[PDB]
């Protein structure tokens, strides 16, 4: 399964971040609808979140599930994080390559201000 | 139609059960259903002569404990490793 | 065994050197690593010697 | 013919559960990871679990594989 392959692909970095006690910006990519959350070091509760399934984000995107939608989600999640005071996060690919939409989201978060 | 008289065990465990089997009784347990298990003592001679019948392990038996008649069935029997004796019997209720 | 101890000399002016081993029978090409030279306090090329 | 053996390696648990250690204290010496490093516990090259903080040793069996972890409760 692609899902299980990706989850085992993510497990190593996820456990490393849990060991480091880092607040992590977890990305989740889907053919449609990229997603981002900022999750506390305890890993059990979400600090902030932003996704193209949100109407306030999807209303300004002609397609949710592309690089522009990913950059929008990245800017949004980094803005909400900076407003809650979360500045130093670690990126979590969730087993996706740091190549396309995921890299666009991470870059948008970086320019918005999240340090990673 | 087998009837076995039994008393409830006051003390239980290794030393108590060994004292019992020395005094020519042997411990048994009754369990099954929602009622708690009941630890009983049986007269070894009586029950050993009874279980010699192959119907002891198929028929519904009755055990008289404190006057109460409990319909049971022989579930498991721990026999002596080499002596013709019984160490323990499990009785499922009904 | 058949592994000979060689000397990696710094390409800086320092006489500093690391020592390692080498299977010269299989790898007859000289080691050309980039190691830290504590005399100049930089990473410079160390080349195999005797 | 027989007659050969090895010097004993003095492996095993050095600090047990609830024991107060200093940072750097060796907790268990092992060959593989019989015990795994938990919070505030590092794993050396020979798989020695050592305390990375001052606290109390704590053993758990967390995880999907039910394997044993050693953490340092920062107490």
């Amino acid at each position: 399964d692609k899902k299980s392959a990706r989850i085992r692909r993510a497990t190593r970095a996820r456990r490393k971040l849990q060991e480091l006690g880092a607040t992590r910006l977890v990305v989740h990519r889907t053919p449609r609808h990229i997603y981002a959350q900022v999750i506390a070091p305890n890993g059990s509760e979400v600090l902030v979140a932003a996704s193209t399934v949100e109407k306030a984000i999807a209303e300004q995107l002609k397609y949710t599930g592309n690089k522009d939608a990913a950059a929008a989600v990245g800017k949004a999640v980094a803005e909400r994080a900076l407003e809650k005071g979360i500045k130093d996060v670690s990126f979590d690919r969730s087993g996706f390559q740091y190549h396309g939409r995921v890299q666009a989201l991470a870059d948008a978060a970086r320019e918005a201000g999240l340090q990673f | 139609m087998f009837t076995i008289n039994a008393e409830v065990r006051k003390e239980q465990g290794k030393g108590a059960s060994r004292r019992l089997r020395a005094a020519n009784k042997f411990p048994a347990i009754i369990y099954g259903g929602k009622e708690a298990p009941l630890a009983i003592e049986l007269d070894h001679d009586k029950v050993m002569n009874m279980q010699a019948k192959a119907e002891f392990y198929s028929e519904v038996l009755t055990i008289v404990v404190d006057g109460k008649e409990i319909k049971v069935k022989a579930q498991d029997v721990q026999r002596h490793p080499y002596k013709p004796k019984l160490q323990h019997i499990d009785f499922v209720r009904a | 065994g058949i592994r000979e101890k060689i000397k990696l000399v710094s390409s800086a002016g320092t006489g500093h050197f690391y020592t390692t081993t080498k299977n010269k029978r299989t790898k007859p090409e000289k080691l050309e690593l980039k190691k830290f030279d504590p005399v100049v306090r930089q990473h410079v090329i160390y080349k195999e010697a005797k | 013919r027989n007659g050969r053996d090895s010097e004993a390696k003095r492996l095993g648990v050095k600090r047990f559960g609830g024991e107060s250690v200093l940072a750097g204290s060796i907790i268990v010496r092992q060959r593989g990871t019989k015990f795994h490093a938990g919070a505030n516990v590092g794993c050396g090259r020979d798989h020695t679990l050592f305390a990375k903080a001052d606290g109390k040793v704590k053993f758990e069996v967390k995880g999907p594989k039910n394997r044993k972890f050693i953490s340092i409760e920062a107490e």
Binding site: - | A54, Y57, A74, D76, V77, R79, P81, Y82 | - | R1, N2
Partner: protein, 136 residues
């Protein structure tokens, strides 16, 4: 003469023989010869007892041997000092605890089974008794 094929090791520690047996029921036949005593059964003793049984009963009836020696016993050669390594494996014994069913028999009357088991128990170093299969 029963003996394992290709064991892991050639020699083993003496060990002890504490405890009660595990195979204490007649599992394969109608009748059985159960050890009241504790000791060692060598393969030669097992084979002698099996021949006594197999002759007392004719070709009729089935016989199970419930015990395997699976344990090598060493001896030192005669006139050898103590030491110089463990001795050589001479024979194999089965360890026997009180209650172990050694042989089972089926397909014969109980009288023939009893006399066959007596003929065989005469060949064994261990005290035995006759048992039958019990329902439960």
């Amino acid at each position: 003469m029963l003996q394992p094929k290709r064991t892991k090791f050639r020699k083993m520690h003496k060990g002890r023989n504490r405890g009660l047996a595990q195979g204490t029921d007649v599992s394969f036949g109608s009748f059985g010869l159960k050890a009241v005593g504790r000791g060692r059964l060598t393969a030669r003793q097992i084979e002698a007892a099996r021949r006594a049984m197999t002759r007392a009963v004719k070709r009729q009836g089935k016989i199970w041997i419930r015990v395997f020696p699976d344990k090598p016993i060493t001896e030192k050669p005669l006139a050898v000092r103590m030491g110089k390594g463990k001795g050589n494996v001479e024979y194999w014994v089965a360890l026997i605890q009180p209650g172990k069913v050694l042989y089972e028999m089926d397909g014969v009357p109980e009288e023939l089974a009893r006399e066959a088991f007596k003929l065989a128990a005469a060949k064994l170093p261990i005290k035995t008794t006759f048992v039958t299969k019990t329902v439960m």
